[PDB]
Design a protein around this ligand. Sequence first.
Ligand code: NA
Length: 129
Amino acid sequence: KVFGRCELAAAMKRHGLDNYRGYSLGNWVCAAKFESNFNTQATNRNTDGSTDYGILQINSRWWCNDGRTPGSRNLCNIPCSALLSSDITASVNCAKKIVSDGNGMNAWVAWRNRCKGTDVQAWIRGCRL
Ligand code: NA
């Protein structure tokens, strides 16, 4: 599924991300825009042999199992293909574990480089929330 911008704010909000670990909803829409272009089905391979899956581009070296990432962990206890669903539930619940882990949202490269320190409220402007 390719979300609309307000459609995904609204959904993120329903699954408890506005202000999760102190990260306001715009930070998240912004991360999802630059990671996945808003598309639950986005996959990207990495040089280490890992792959990034779904709307938030969560990595198979630590968080999900894809069966082809040797010696990797599955810290969210789900196959990686669960992260490509039109229902962003599993992506959200795994994202809450990742943002808890010590480095906050800096774990999303593209958040760090494209969203951090910017006016991220602009990602939810106009939306009926
Ligand atoms: Na894994």
